[PDB]
Design a protein around this ligand. Structure first.
Ligand SMILES: O=S(=O)(Nc1ccc2c(c1)N(S(=O)(=O)Cc1ccc(C(F)(F)F)cc1)CCC2)c1ccc(F)cc1F
Ligand SMILES: O=S(=O)(Nc1ccc2c(c1)N(S(=O)(=O)Cc1ccc(C(F)(F)F)cc1)CCC2)c1ccc(F)cc1F
Lengths: 201, 201
């Protein structure tokens, strides 16, 4: 449990990288590529039905990739079908949300969506202004932690692999996986000098 | 195709009745059982996260029952796995919405939700006031058609079994199912003297 834990970090990070939808360098570069008023207006003039379809498609894709990420964690495939589903039900949306913070630009308060960056107003046709502001505020406050890629990988791993979830058959097995991931997270934070973030999550 | 079509109506209606979540008589009776201010306030004070969980659970249940209804239609099981999924993806939410009109009371503008009736304000914590009003307006306008149970059964059947859906392997097979359901719908409307509704949907 020294080279074993160092392989778990390498593994979690690789599983994350190969199941992240977008490469970070493209997300950062594309910050300058902002939707015009004309384009934003095009999205706002879409019917409530059309927009919900579009946005539901993207969410579904995002969740699929989170499933692929979960399957890639050591031990996740060894859980009974009930537990796999429970952990994904309790964890997926939180992982999508943390993953989305990468696509959020706190400087101008925009997100990457369908190839360009735009603000909350993009989603006006959905009729969820309050919900969308709360999603943006979450991203905003999470972006102030300046999470590295490797940190997202390890942290989203711990979000999914949570033994406290209601409905779980094998609490003890999940506890072991969780514990190994906790060791992995805290180890990588020690070597990178980033222990300070533990207090503020 | 006279006793055959009369058996299809009986069949569709029975499949609907055994996959409707709530009996209509209970829905109508429970119209008088309205949430108090105290109870409505309890829902509004729930966090955005808590309410979304609750409402997502109910939606998921509603969709499950719509799946059971689809499987119960003659020919639906005979479609390849791709087509089954396509038709459910394109149709489910529309069926949920039509089914929900039964739980909507146009007289006081309330819906049945978790055991009592309440208005739009129940869902304030979700942050989707615009979306929720559009759902209520849909129910409102649909409730003015005064759809019988048998009519919902046959109409929701035609919503799902639509050959025009993008992504379909066996367009010709779905066309045959659709056509039989169209015959069944129009037949039942003839015998019940309710041809007038065809113009206004
Ligand atoms: O390409 S996206 O679909 N763009 C995007 C970026 C931000 C948002 C939305 C969509 N949407 S959406 O409805 O089309 C899909 C969506 C994404 C995330 C969430 C979240 F609440 F779980 F975070 C909900 C819906 C509205 C909420 C904010 C995307 C999805 C996941 C991700 F990690 C990054 C993304 F850019
Ligand atoms: O017991 S319900 O869950 N109560 C109910 C009645 C009306 C609504 C909601 C919930 N919700 S919800 O978010 O908790 C579940 C939901 C139900 C229907 C739809 C619809 F848009 F597809 F119609 C969306 C969400 C908000 C929209 C209006 C229910 C679900 C389906 C149904 F056909 C009848 C119901 F009463």
């Amino acid at each position: 449990s020294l080279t074993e834990i160092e392989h778990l970090v390498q593994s979690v990070c690789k599983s994350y990288r190969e199941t992240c939808q977008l490469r970070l360098e493209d997300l950062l570069r594309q910050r300058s590529n902002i939707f015009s008023r004309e384009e934003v207006t095009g999205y706002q003039r879409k019917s409530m039905w059309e927009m919900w379809e579009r946005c539901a498609h993207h969410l579904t894709e995002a969740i699929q990739y989170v499933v692929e990420f979960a399957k890639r964690l050591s031990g996740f495939m060894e859980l009974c079908q009930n537990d796999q589903i429970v952990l994904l039900k309790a964890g997926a949306m939180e992982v999508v949300l943390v993953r989305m913070c990468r696509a959020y630009n706190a400087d101008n308060r925009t997100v990457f969506f369908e190839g360009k960056y735009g603000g909350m107003e993009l989603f006006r046709a959905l009729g969820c202004s309050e919900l969308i502001s709360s999603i943006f505020d979450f991203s905003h406050s999470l972006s102030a932690l300046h999470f590295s890629e490797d940190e997202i990988a390890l942290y989203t791993a711990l979000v999914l692999i949570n033994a406290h979830r209601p409905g779980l058959q094998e609490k003890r097995k999940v506890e072991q996986l969780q514990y190994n991931l906790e060791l992995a997270f805290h180890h990588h934070l020690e070597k990178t000098h980033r222990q300070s973030i533990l207090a503020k999550l």
